Design a protein around this ligand. Structure first.
Ligand SMILES: CCCCCCCCCCCCCCCCCC(=O)OC[C@H](COP(=O)(O)OCCN)OC(=O)CCCCCCCCCCCCCCCCC
Ligand SMILES: CCCCCCCCCCCCCCCCCC(=O)OC[C@H](COP(=O)(O)OCCN)OC(=O)CCCCCCCCCCCCCCCCC
Ligand SMILES: CCCCCCCCCCCCCCCCCC(=O)OC[C@H](COP(=O)(O)OCCN)OC(=O)CCCCCCCCCCCCCCCCC
Ligand SMILES: CCCCCCCCCCCCCCCCCC(=O)OC[C@H](COP(=O)(O)OCCN)OC(=O)CCCCCCCCCCCCCCCCC
Ligand SMILES: CCCCCCCCCCCCCCCCCC(=O)OC[C@H](COP(=O)(O)OCCN)OC(=O)CCCCCCCCCCCCCCCCC
Ligand SMILES: CCCCCCCCCCCCCCCCCC(=O)OC[C@H](COP(=O)(O)OCCN)OC(=O)CCCCCCCCCCCCCCCCC
Ligand SMILES: CCCCCCCCCCCCCCCCCC(=O)OC[C@H](COP(=O)(O)OCCN)OC(=O)CCCCCCCCCCCCCCCCC
Ligand SMILES: CCCCCCCCCCCCCCCCCC(=O)OC[C@H](COP(=O)(O)OCCN)OC(=O)CCCCCCCCCCCCCCCCC
Ligand SMILES: CCCCCCCCCCCCO[C@@H]1O[C@H](CO)[C@@H](O[C@H]2O[C@H](CO)[C@@H](O)[C@H](O)[C@H]2O)[C@H](O)[C@H]1O
Ligand SMILES: CCCCCCCCCCCCO[C@@H]1O[C@H](CO)[C@@H](O[C@H]2O[C@H](CO)[C@@H](O)[C@H](O)[C@H]2O)[C@H](O)[C@H]1O
Ligand SMILES: CCCCCCCCCCCCO[C@@H]1O[C@H](CO)[C@@H](O[C@H]2O[C@H](CO)[C@@H](O)[C@H](O)[C@H]2O)[C@H](O)[C@H]1O
Ligand SMILES: CCCCCCCCCCCCO[C@@H]1O[C@H](CO)[C@@H](O[C@H]2O[C@H](CO)[C@@H](O)[C@H](O)[C@H]2O)[C@H](O)[C@H]1O
Ligand SMILES: CCCCCCCCCCCCO[C@@H]1O[C@H](CO)[C@@H](O[C@H]2O[C@H](CO)[C@@H](O)[C@H](O)[C@H]2O)[C@H](O)[C@H]1O
Ligand SMILES: CCCCCCCCCCCCO[C@@H]1O[C@H](CO)[C@@H](O[C@H]2O[C@H](CO)[C@@H](O)[C@H](O)[C@H]2O)[C@H](O)[C@H]1O
Lengths: 49, 52, 345, 142, 459, 99, 19, 120, 63, 56
């Protein structure tokens, strides 16, 4: 123990960490998936391959 | 309107009593109903500049 | 205020502009402006001292008078055309009093004199609402009737606001008065372009808001009301010195900061319409703003003013502010010029 | 209104001719600017009595009318003597004469000197604008 | 240019992620390596100028200015180390980042292909420059120097912005190559005469033109040494470089529009060089010497001849190295006795014999001793002006006499006579200080060996 | 008076480290900063940069142009043509105004 | 000499009601 | 200017006709710069809270980077669509009005008499 | 590389910049005509909505 | 090798990696500008036997 007063940030906010990694990992997956469908629809509509 | 929320939701909070030709209680036509109906209908779909 | 009062009053502050922006009927637009005036007064006077009472009273009598003139125009147009919206056939004098009254609501010069006084008399977080959220409803009305507005009155209001915003901010030692004159100058730019390109009015409004919001948060961090108070930042919260300096230079429109974009694009569009003389005058006098921002940068981050002994006790204390909204707005208000094509069209 | 037409009469005839009419027009314009300025001055910086307010209105209006008279006269005489109707330099000389008048009325060589340069440049640019078809308040086009 | 700009941008993380004891050694070394890479721009085996993309190009005018910019960054870092050694670690890193920022901005400025891009980068440089002057200048007058510098530039730059928008609205582009090929004669209207001035004033204030030069003596006396180096060497050359790029579209009005600016420069170069005879402040003397030299650059660009453009290009580079050297030499005495008064330290050849040699060569460069590129630029400018009007040689002749007088006056006053022996704090020259002088003077000699590299666009 | 530090005293840099090179108060940091400047500045940039510039071939096509000039001077002289003509453009390719 | 920094007399020119 | 155009849906962020356009690359330089700004926002936030600038809150830093890229991608799609519509309208209008936009037959420099202005 | 690469990349740069220049001038011409005549997709300023006109038989006949 | 050593000397890859990445971006700029490769008046020719492009 060092601080005479207990810090507010003594240990991670485990809920906040989990939500943050969940939000970022979900957004990366949704971004990549949405980009995949956006490519296929573009090719379908323009008759490409 | 600046934000077309009413059009997007398909509701009418204030679009339906905007001019003389609008719906009146007990079907009491306002003065100049037929002239305003003709002016609004001529102008429809062509924009304000041409309508003028 | 207890929670029920806060919820109702803040909800009405939010509601008014939403009504104004969504209304087809001009009477409902006026109703929206009425909600804004009524709901903001108790917040202006919340702290209850003679200065806040003066500020709330001056705000009320100006805003209520302007609201009556706006209502007169709406009623006169209803008499002329039997409708509740301004048309191409609306009498030009009716449109000119609408412009006059809305510009008085916005604090554009020469209807500006109230705004530096009211901003000085209220808490910083209320100045923030006054200079950002409260601009949206009157501007939203103007944008709807932009083809109908008189370019002569607009440019005269616009150049007057830029001139008096500049000379006004040059004499100030109070931060709340500097922000008020900064508001007036930027409103002058927003208005000048409205009859030509209302999208560029909105671009300037957005960039002004995301510059002004974090500037107010930076003042709020230590409650710095004067130049001498903000000059103690180097000792109280030195980490803010970089972002305050860049936000001030961005407000002044110095390239390559984001705040150069609104002045640059509005000049481009004004000169596409042969408005060369006004654009030149506007751009030249906007340099005077950069002067008083620079003097402010001189006293915060580029020199170190004398500090005091009690400030050492402040360095022992931990802070919980600013929130992370400050960093987001601070970065996007200064470092987004590379993304300029995505902001204008 | 006809009042607008009275001001379009300044350009009905080339510069350097009808110098009497052009001096009345610019004297009238100067007086109007003095009345507008006086109105804002007394309203926002009220005088100690009504006779001082009225005295200040007269001081501003006559001084502004004097500047407009000297500008209009000197510009026309300069074009008449030099036989150059379309020269912006004639307007620079007139604007400098107006700037010197302002300094003479306010007892200031710095205002005379600074007045001469700023008013000369503004008047010269006005003539260039008239020749090259610049618009002060263009209506929207694009 | 991306293979030059990207490594320059990586100097910023390198500065901030280095250990406190490795920052200077790291950033200086890679800054030297980036100067090496910029020499690739000199591989020009044809007469088609390098267009790397729509955005960046390099031709025989920008290439020397880009390389000189790249070379100055290491030199400025070495110049700054001693007077920053009392600043804490974060303040040292902040200073280095300001120096890197100018290097990045200036390289982009000289390689921009489009005029509003040039304008944005041209204006961006004011921010790091102002910060350097006002945060690390020594005296209370540094704040006034910042105001003059910023607002002399800005008032001229606003008309430039209007002219650039106006040209683009009329032509549809501000790309320089297309403006060159599609240029058409201008009519000699009052409106076009104002257009000419709007296009020229910001560049002329930046040179600076005599009459609007007061910002430069103020800025130099108050700036730290690395600020003086970049300001004299590169920042003044933005005006000359701007004038050469934009004058291609201004014909034929430059034939009569140039007269007041040739007159101010040719007469002004005598006024500012004669000031150097009675200047008590050594930094101010070197600064007024620059105004006199840049007056020649203004005159030769105004007359627009193949010789005049070539003489201006050489003088731009030669003055860049020479003036930066003189500021560094003056700063070495100031760091010992902390005064800029020229007459204070005296007889210094007695105690700093090798530094006195660097002083002599810098002075010989400054008075344009042949066959230096300093003389070559001034000579071809003199030939072109004589062709423009044979009476120009009278004013040239007076300036040549005066330039020798003050150049040798500075050497005699500070290096010779009796040593001011109360100055017991005259520590021997640093290895760093003597190295810094050599890094200026070797390129000057090497460029004198191969003067084809700095002839510019016309030869 | 206010509370302010006195001005620091003049220091002789060579008193503690008589091998000071000007770069750093730490002796080991000092000598390596000196070596990096001399190695990268002089051994690398000034020597190899000078070499690279020296061997840039036909800089701005000056060697080709003299070679091309001699070819044309040779050709234009055996065939009796003028060495250089007044008109760059053949007049047949130009259509002047009638007036 | 030490770098100049604002003293009391310099800071007092911003202590007035106006500039 | 374009708001009242035919087939204009109100408050539609991405109209279905925008799905014919090629989507932006996920390593588009504008999207890479957006993610860099999000990274700067995280570092600036650490500085303002007196935290280790690079070390503290990597979860918070990652969310800042991902949010900027995520939002920027969809906003970039909308901006691509608006510019495409502008060109679709401009060219379509040009075709309906061939009398206002004639093809101007340009002359060669063999016929054009530009004035010569001697430099001397 | 040989001089061909830089030479031909310049032509490619020239073609793009030229075509952007003519597209920039043409847009201003289009905007001018569309705003003055109101006959295009742009500058279509609103007019009253006709779907809210009441077309029912009224209380009186002559309406 | 060693966390104390690597934590000090890893920064030596930044500028070299900026150069290599800067070179990579410059080659991508060449690829976007091939619209006149082997099509100019001055240089266009017939392709050599096993040649796909005149420059890359
Ligand atoms: C263009 C800009 C568009 C994107 C703007 C929004 C930027 C994202 C902001 C979120 C963020 O940066 O993280 C904040 C927070 C991290 O958690 P933490 O630092 O521990 O705070 C908890 C307080 N005790 O994150 C959270 O805790 C929230 C949990 C995730 C929910 C979303
Ligand atoms: C809606 O209110 O937008 C207003 C205005 C666009 O104008 P307008 O077309 O008239 O509005 C009708 C439909 N938007 O919209 C605007 O003016 C745009 C406001 C932009 C504010 C810029 C602040 C900097 C933020 C930069 C991050 C945003 C994303 C950057 C691009 C991402 C792509 C990589
Ligand atoms: C202190 C504050 C510092 C922050 C401000 C920096 C200075 C701002 C100056 C504004 C001008 C920035 C350059 C804008 C032009 C540009 O970057 O081009 C568009 C760019 C495309 O990248 P490019 O490689 O150049 O072109 C090939 C297409 N992929 O697409 C992009 O937009 C990439 C954005 C990254 C630019 C770096
Ligand atoms: C047309 C001529 C317009 C002249 C502009 C007004 C100038 C009047 C003036 O002199 O200033 C009035 C006021 C104080 O002036 P005062 O103190 O009396 O004089 C100095 C005493 N030593 O100074 C002030 O407080 C400023 C004056 C009020 C603002 C004037 C607004 C000008 C008109 C803009 C209309 C735009 C229409 C849209
Ligand atoms: C931006 C461009 C800036 C760069 C261009 C610089 C070019 C200027 C060159 C010519 C300047 C010559 C000035 C000589 C010095 C004179 C001087 O210093 O005194 C100025 C004097 C000061 O005023 P004062 O004596 O204190 O009396 C009280 C006035 N209220 O007088 C004054 O200050 C008040 C004078 C007011 C009258 C001048 C005209 C003002 C109205 C503009 C009209 C334009 C339309
Ligand atoms: C006097 C004693 C001679 C000392 C130098 C000897 C080195 C040498 O061999 O140089 C000779 C060579 C001459 O070659 P050349 O120009 O073709 O001669 C004309 C036709 N025979 O000259 C050269 O090619 C060397 C040219 C010097 C190259 C400079 C090396 C890097 C410079 C560092 C950057 C600093 C300069 C910044 C400004 C540069 C502007 C481009
Ligand atoms: C102050 C602000 C200045 C910030 C400077 C940072 C560099 C600008 C950010 C964008 C750099 C990446 C980039 O521009 O290229 C994106 C690349 C694919 O690009 P591509 O579409 O293939 O073609 C472009 C040809 N010009 O896609 C990629 O593969 C890039 C992935 C790596 C992330 C970019 C790394 C940039 C390294 C420089 C950091 C320097 C930061 C200095 C601050
Ligand atoms: C992929 C990456 C490829 C490029 C890798 C380049 C090589 C990087 C390693 C170079 C540094 C070697 C280790 C080092 O830190 O140098 C030690 C030296 C003295 O440090 P000190 O703490 O005093 O230890 C005393 C030892 N007798 O401290 C120093 O002064 C070293 C100075 C380093 C200067 C930068 C080196 C640039 C190398 C050329 C880059 C090539 C690309
Ligand atoms: C601010 C935004 C978020 C909050 C949203 C708004 C909803 C808030 C819900 C909690 C509100 C309850 O708040 C509560 O209000 C009542 C009003 O009857 C007050 O109570 C009031 O009536 C009771 C009667 O017994 C007494 O306490 C007293 O006469 C008076 O104060 C309480 O002192 C306050 O605690
Ligand atoms: C286009 C180029 C962009 C240029 C970017 C501009 C960068 C920012 C410039 C403003 C500088 C911020 O201002 C600078 O703030 C830092 C803290 O961050 C201060 O830093 C210094 O003082 C503070 C206390 O005051 C100490 O805690 C700190 O360790 C020390 O280094 C500097 O003394 C101040 O001058
Ligand atoms: C003392 C120097 C002052 C420097 C400021 C500039 C001075 C120049 C302006 C005065 C010149 C003469 O005055 C100017 O000409 C006449 C007056 O009859 C009017 O001239 C103009 O009138 C109207 C503008 O409303 C135009 O549509 C009209 O085409 C034109 O003739 C202007 O309203 C007036 O500005
Ligand atoms: C073509 C050139 C024509 C030249 C004439 C036009 C230029 C006009 C210049 C006006 C100069 C100002 O006019 C001058 O103001 C000074 C101010 O000290 C006043 O001077 C007088 O009063 C002041 C105080 O009021 C005393 O200090 C002074 O000793 C006394 O001479 C006078 O009013 C007048 O002498
Ligand atoms: C220091 C203060 C001065 C700042 C200088 C500002 C930049 C330089 C100003 C140059 C003046 C512009 O000069 C003016 O340009 C405009 C716009 O193209 C053109 O002028 C014309 O434009 C269009 C035609 O294109 C006409 O409809 C218009 O009525 C007329 O003004 C002429 O070319 C010239 O009259
Ligand atoms: C800035 C620093 C620059 C560093 C410079 C280092 C350059 C090194 C020079 C290497 C020169 C020798 O280069 C070598 O020469 C031979 C000559 O046999 C040539 O080789 C070519 O011609 C020879 C002639 O016999 C054939 O046999 C051979 O099959 C063919 O490839 C090439 O040119 C190259 O393969």
């Amino acid at each position: 123990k060092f601080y005479v007063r207990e810090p507010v940030n003594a240990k991670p906010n485990w809920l906040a960490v989990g939500l943050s990694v969940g939000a970022s990992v979900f957004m990366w997956i949704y971004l990549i998936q949405t980009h995949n469908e956006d490519v296929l629809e573009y090719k379908r509509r323009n008759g490409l391959e | 309107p600046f934000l077309d929320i009413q059009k997007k939701l398909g509701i009418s909070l204030d679009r339906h009593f905007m001019f003389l030709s609008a719906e009146q209680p007990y079907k009491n036509a306002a003065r100049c109903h037929a002239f305003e109906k003709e002016w609004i209908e001529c102008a429809h779909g062509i924009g304000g500049t041409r309508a003028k | 205020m207890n929670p029920i009062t806060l919820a109702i009053i803040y909800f009405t502050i939010f509601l008014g502009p939403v009504i104004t922006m969504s209304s087809t009927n001009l009477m409902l637009m006026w109703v929206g402006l009425e909600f804004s005036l009524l709901a903001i007064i108790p917040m202006l006077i919340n702290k209850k001292n003679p200065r806040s009472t003066e500020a709330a009273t001056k705000y009320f009598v100006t805003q209520a008078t302007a609201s009556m003139i706006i209502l007169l125009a709406i009623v006169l147009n209803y008499k002329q055309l039997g409708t509740w919206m301004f048309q191409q056939q609306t009498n030009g004098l009716i449109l000119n009093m609408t412009l006059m009254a809305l510009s008085m609501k916005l604090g554009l010069a020469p209807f500006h004199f109230w705004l530096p006084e009211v901003t000085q008399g209220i808490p910083l977080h209320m100045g923030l609402i006054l200079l950002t959220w409260q601009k949206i409803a009157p501007l939203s009305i103007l944008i709807q009737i932009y083809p109908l507005l008189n370019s002569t009155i607009i440019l005269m209001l616009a150049i007057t606001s830029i001139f008096m915003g500049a000379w006004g901010g040059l004499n100030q030692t109070q931060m709340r008065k500097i922000m008020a004159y900064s508001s007036i100058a930027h409103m002058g730019w927003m208005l000048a372009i409205l009859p030509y390109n209302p999208s560029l009015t909105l671009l300037n409004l957005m960039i002004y808001i995301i510059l002004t919001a974090p500037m107010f948060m930076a003042l709020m961090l230590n409650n710095s009301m004067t130049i001498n108070s903000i000059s103690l930042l180097w000792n109280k919260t030195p980490a803010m010195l970089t972002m305050i300096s860049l936000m001030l230079l961005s407000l002044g429109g110095l390239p390559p900061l984001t705040g150069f974009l609104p002045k640059w694009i509005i000049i481009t569009e004004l000169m596409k319409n042969n408005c060369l003389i006004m654009a030149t005058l506007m751009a030249m006098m906007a340099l005077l703003n950069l002067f008083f921002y620079t003097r402010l940068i001189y006293s915060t981050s580029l020199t170190m003013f004398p500090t005091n002994n009690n400030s050492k006790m402040m360095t022992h204390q931990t802070k919980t502010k600013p929130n992370l909204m400050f960093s987001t707005l601070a970065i996007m208000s200064t470092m987004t010029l590379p993304l300029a094509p995505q902001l204008i069209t | 209104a006809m009042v607008k037409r009275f001001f379009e009469s300044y350009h009905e005839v080339p510069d350097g001719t009808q110098c009497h009419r052009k001096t009345y027009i610019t004297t009238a314009l100067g007086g109007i600017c003095g009345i507008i300025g006086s109105a804002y001055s007394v309203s926002l910086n009220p005088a100690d009595s009504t006779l001082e307010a009225v005295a200040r209105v007269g001081r501003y209006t006559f001084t502004a009318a004097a500047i407009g008279a000297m500008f209009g006269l000197t510009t026309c005489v300069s074009a008449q003597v030099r036989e150059k109707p379309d020269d912006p330099l004639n307007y620079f000389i007139g604007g400098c004469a107006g700037g010197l008048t302002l300094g003479a009325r306010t007892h200031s060589y710095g205002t005379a000197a600074m007045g001469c340069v700023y008013m000369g440049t503004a008047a010269a640019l006005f003539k260039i604008g008239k020749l090259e078809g610049w618009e002060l308040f263009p209506t929207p086009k694009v | 240019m991306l293979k030059i700009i990207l490594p320059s941008l990586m100097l910023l993380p390198l500065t901030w992620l280095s250990s406190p004891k490795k920052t200077w050694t790291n950033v200086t070394s890679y800054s030297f390596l980036i100067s090496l890479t910029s020499l690739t721009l000199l591989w020009q085996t044809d007469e088609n100028y390098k267009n790397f993309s729509n955005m960046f190009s390099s031709d025989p005018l920008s290439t020397p200015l880009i390389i000189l910019t790249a070379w100055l960054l290491p030199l400025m870092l070495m110049a700054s180390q001693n007077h920053l050694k009392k600043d804490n670690n974060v303040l040292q890193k902040l200073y280095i980042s300001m120096l890197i920022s100018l290097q990045i901005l200036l390289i982009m400025t000289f390689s921009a292909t489009e005029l509003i891009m040039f304008y944005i980068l041209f204006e961006a440089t004011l921010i790091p420059t102002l910060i350097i002057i006002t945060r690390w200048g020594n005296q209370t007058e540094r704040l006034n120097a910042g105001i003059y510098f910023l607002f002399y530039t800005l008032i001229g730059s606003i008309p430039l912005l209007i002219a650039l928008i106006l040209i683009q609205n009329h032509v549809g582009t501000l790309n320089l190559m297309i403006l060159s090929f599609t240029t058409h004669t201008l009519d000699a209207s009052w409106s076009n005469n104002l257009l000419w001035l709007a296009c020229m004033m910001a560049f002329l204030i930046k040179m600076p033109l005599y009459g609007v030069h007061l910002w430069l003596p103020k800025a130099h006396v108050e700036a730290p040494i690395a600020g003086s180096m970049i300001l004299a060497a590169i920042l003044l050359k933005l005006g000359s470089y701007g004038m050469i790029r934009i004058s291609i579209i201004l014909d034929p009005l430059t034939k009569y529009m140039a007269y007041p600016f040739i007159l101010l420069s040719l007469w002004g170069m005598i006024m500012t060089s004669s000031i150097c005879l009675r200047q008590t402040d050594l930094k101010s003397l070197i600064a007024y010497s620059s105004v006199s030299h840049m007056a020649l650059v203004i005159a030769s660009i105004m007359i627009q001849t193949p010789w005049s453009f070539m003489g201006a290009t050489m003088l731009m580079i030669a003055h860049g190295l020479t003036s930066s050297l003189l500021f560094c030499l003056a700063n070495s005495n100031y760091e010992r006795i902390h005064s800029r008064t020229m007459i204070m330290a005296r007889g210094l050849q007695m105690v700093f014999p090798l530094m006195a040699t660097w002083w002599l060569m810098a002075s010989l460069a400054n008075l344009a001793l042949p066959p230096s590129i300093n003389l070559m630029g001034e000579l071809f400018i003199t030939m072109s002006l004589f062709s423009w009007s044979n009476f120009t040689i009278i004013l040239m002749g007076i300036n040549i006499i005066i330039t020798g007088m003050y150049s040798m006056y500075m050497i005699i006053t500070t290096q010779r006579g009796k040593l001011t022996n109360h100055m017991i704090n005259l520590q021997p020259s640093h290895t760093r200080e003597l190295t810094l002088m050599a890094l200026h003077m070797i390129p000057l000699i090497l460029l004198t060996t191969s003067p084809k590299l700095i002839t510019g666009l016309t030869m | 008076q206010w509370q302010e530090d006195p001005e620091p005293e003049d220091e002789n840099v060579y008193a503690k480290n008589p091998d000071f090179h000007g770069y750093d108060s730490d002796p080991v940091v000092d000598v390596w900063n000196m070596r990096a400047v001399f190695f990268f500045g002089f051994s690398i940039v000034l020597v190899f940069g000078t070499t690279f510039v020296a061997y840039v071939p036909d800089y701005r096509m000056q060697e080709w142009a003299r070679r091309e000039a001699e070819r044309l001077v040779k050709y234009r002289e055996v065939n009796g043509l003028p060495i250089m003509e007044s008109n760059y453009f053949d007049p047949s390719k130009i259509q002047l105004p009638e007036d | 000499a030490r770098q100049w920094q604002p003293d009391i007399e310099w800071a007092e020119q911003f202590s007035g009601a106006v500039m | 200017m374009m708001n009242g155009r035919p087939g204009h849906e109100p408050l539609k962020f991405l109209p279905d006709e925008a799905r014919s356009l090629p989507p932006p690359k996920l390593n588009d330089p504008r999207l890479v710069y957006m993610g860099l700004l999000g990274y700067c926002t995280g570092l600036m936030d650490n500085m303002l809270r007196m935290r280790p600038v690079m070390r503290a809150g990597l979860h918070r830093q990652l969310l800042f980077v991902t949010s900027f890229v995520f939002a920027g991608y969809f906003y970039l799609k909308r901006q691509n669509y608006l510019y495409a519509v502008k060109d679709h309208d401009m060219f379509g209008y040009i075709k309906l009005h061939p009398e206002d936009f004639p093809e101007k037959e340009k002359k060669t420099y063999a016929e054009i008499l530009e004035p010569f202005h001697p430099v001397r | 590389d040989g001089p061909e690469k830089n030479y031909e990349k310049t032509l490619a740069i020239l073609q793009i910049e030229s075509e952007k220049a003519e597209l920039r001038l043409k847009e201003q011409e289009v905007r001018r005509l569309m705003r003055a005549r109101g006959d295009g997709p742009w500058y279509q300023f609103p007019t009253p909505e006709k779907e809210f006109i009441d077309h029912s038989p009224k209380a009186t006949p002559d309406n | 090798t060693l966390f104390q050593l690597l934590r000090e000397h890893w920064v030596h890859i930044l500028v070299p990696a900026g150069f290599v990445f800067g070179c990579y971006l410059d080659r991508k700029d060449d690829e976007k500008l091939t619209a006149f490769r082997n099509k100019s008046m001055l240089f266009q020719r017939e392709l050599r036997p096993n040649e796909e492009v005149t420059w890359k």
